[PDB]
Amino acid sequence: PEHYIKHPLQNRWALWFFKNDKSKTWQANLRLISKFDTVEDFWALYNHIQLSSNLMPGCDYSLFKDGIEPMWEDEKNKRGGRWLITLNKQQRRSDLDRFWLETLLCLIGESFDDYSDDVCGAVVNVRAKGDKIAIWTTECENRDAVTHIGRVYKERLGLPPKIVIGYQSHADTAKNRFVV
Ligand SMILES: C[n+]1cn([C@@H]2O[C@H](COP(=O)(O)O[P@](=O)(S)OP(=O)(O)OC[C@H]3O[C@@H](n4cnc5c(=O)nc(N)[nH]c54)[C@H](O)[C@@H]3O)[C@H]3OC(C)(C)O[C@H]32)c2nc(N)[nH]c(=O)c21
């Protein structure tokens, strides 16, 4: 078994791409790229696509559990929210790509213990004004789940205690509820 089988991930994941085109509605700009459910298929996908730092501004990547679309409207996102990492323009060079890949591995490696079931997915927004990365969770009222994912996330990105990150509900997005 060991010699020849791919290594299965706990979940099947879908990678999505967004390109800003003012000709189209936001949802029409959102497109699914492919899915994978093994370590080896993840790295084949990742190794084939552009680093976030190399995308034109206005683009997003999103990685979500199969069955969950990367949009507020989805039943598993409507009552939820996101842990938000805001980066300055200098961090495009220094942090964007490494932070995004760490976010990817927190999801597929199920890095948040009993609360990895609350995880829906993650998004990186590439923007001239300042890039963003976020982990989306499914229920903004689940205080223990949300806070625990926030603490683990902050430390896995190696952020200092001088930084604070915020959790915002999509309901208000469409203010911070929690900070760690
Ligand atoms: C995650 N998400 C994002 N959006 C859309 O993206 C925007 C929200 O994201 P955020 O607050 O980060 O803004 P951002 O992504 S930094 O966009 P931006 O301000 O850089 O965009 C530049 C300009 O272009 C406009 N824009 C942005 N995306 C699109 C677009 O896809 N199509 C058109 N026609 N115009 C667009 C936007 O209104 C702005 O004036 C909202 O704009 C509109 C089109 C009104 O819908 C929102 C969403 N819409 C829905 N229904 N559901 C979502 O989950 C969702």
Q: Is 72 in the pocket of ligand 1 (CB under 6 A)?
A: yes
**Contact residues for 126 (Cβ-Cβ < 8 A; gap 6+):** 52, 53, 55, 56, 57, 58, 59, 60, 96
Q: How far apart are CA 2 and CA 154, in angstroms?
A: 34
Q: How far apart are CA 176 and CA 180, in angstroms?
A: 11
Number of helices and strands in the chain (H, E): 6, 8
Write down how long the chain is: 180
Query: Could you give the C-alpha distances from 74 to 10, 17, 45, 69, 174, in angstroms and in order?
Result: 22, 17, 25, 6, 13
* Ligand 1 mean position, distance from CA 165 (Å): 22
Burial degree of 78 (CB within 10 A; 0-12, 13-18, 19+): middle
Residue 56, phi then psi, degrees to nearest 5: -60, 145
Residue 97, phi then psi, degrees to nearest 5: -65, -45
Q: Is 78 in the pocket of ligand 1 (CB under 6 A)?
A: no
Pocket probe mutation, ligand 1, options 16, 26, 55, 84, max atoms within 8 Å of Cβ? 26
Q: How many CB atoms lie within 10 A of CB 16?
A: 19
Give the CATH class of 1-180: alpha beta
Query: Could you give the C-alpha distances from 141 to 24, 78, 80, 105, in angstroms and in order?
Result: 34, 12, 8, 25
SS3 for 18-56 is: ECCCCCCCHHHHEEEEEEEEEHHHHHHHHHHCCCHHHCC
Residue 74, phi then psi, degrees to nearest 5: -60, 140
Bridge partners of residue 14, in order along the sequence: 35, 64
Torsional class of 167: left (φ above 0), alpha (ψ -120 to 50), beta (otherwise)? beta
Single out the residue of 19, 146, 121 nearest to residue 70, CA to CA.
121
Q: How far apart are CA 13 and CA 57, in angstroms?
A: 25
Longest CA–CA separation in the chain, Å: 51
166-169 β-sheet, strand order: 30-38, 8-18, 60-65, 119-125, 132-137, 81-86, 166-169, 178-179
Q: How far apart are CA 79 and CA 87, in angstroms?
A: 26
